[PDB]
Design a protein around this ligand. Sequence first.
Ligand SMILES: O=C(O)/C=C/c1ccc2c(=O)[nH]c(Cc3cc(Cl)ccc3NCc3cccc(F)c3)nc2c1
Ligand SMILES: [Mg+2]
Ligand SMILES: [Zn+2]
Length: 292
Amino acid sequence: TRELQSLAAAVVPSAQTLKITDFSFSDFELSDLETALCTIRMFTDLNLVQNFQMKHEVLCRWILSVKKNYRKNVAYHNWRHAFNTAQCMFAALKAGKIQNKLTDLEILALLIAALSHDLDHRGVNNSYIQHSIMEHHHFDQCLMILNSPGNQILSGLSIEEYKTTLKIIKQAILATDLALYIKRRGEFFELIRKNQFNLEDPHQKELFLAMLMTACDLSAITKPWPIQQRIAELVATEFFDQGNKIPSMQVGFIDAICLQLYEALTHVSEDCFPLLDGCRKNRQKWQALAEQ
Ligand SMILES: O=C(O)/C=C/c1ccc2c(=O)[nH]c(Cc3cc(Cl)ccc3NCc3cccc(F)c3)nc2c1
Ligand SMILES: [Mg+2]
Ligand SMILES: [Zn+2]
């Protein structure tokens, strides 16, 4: 109640003041409350609070419920990673101008999905505790919080809108399984190579939303060099010391997973180039360290 009292009583600084429009945004100098304020600003400047009549204390309570259900003892898969994934989605919609290509229900679902896509993660080396098992657990945590008393930020939607938004939320969270990304990326790439990518097609729109979620999920690989070095530290902490080879592992991850995706994203919207650009500069830096 103390944290909710302070957060509800705060003034929400603008998007420019909070720097959440920048693809190079970082969160190291922000408190928990400050990340909650940036999240409120994300919902506000996407007109989600307006078009769906969210009450202020319900959104604040929902944000605090989502943050609380991430585990601080996990080095990378924690609330700050979820907060960063949502920030990148915001920057991609605004600075990347992806907003105009999607409906309000799609935007609403992507922001909720990005914030919720890793709920109750306990670390890669704690997989035993329990077709994308973890992503189904993540969505289940997301739905329970959405249904909790005082936390129902979707109450203003009609039953049709609500059923539609949950369907998109679920597919967006399921898309954060790398296995699903590997399975479906060939179709996404082949459509772009043949100059045949059309979002008016429902099947291709869902495929683009899947790829966009993966782009935001891994977007730490695109950050400026001092930030990426620190994020790579968190990944190495979670992988090895929880539950140097880092430079070459970062290069292989960039080659096998990241480069094509951010290239495909740039063809769809040229304003998403800073993600591809930042990903390339990090491959340059990591490869040099690997060579020593
Ligand atoms: O799932 C999410 O939300 C996002 C996934 C994600 C994001 C960034 C990177 C990255 O920058 N690099 C590597 C490669 C890597 C390097 C090193 Cl040194 C050690 C392990 C690995 N990958 C395995 C791994 C272990 C533990 C945590 C983890 F996230 C990934 N994979 C990443 C995976
Ligand atoms: Mg995940
Ligand atoms: Zn994730």
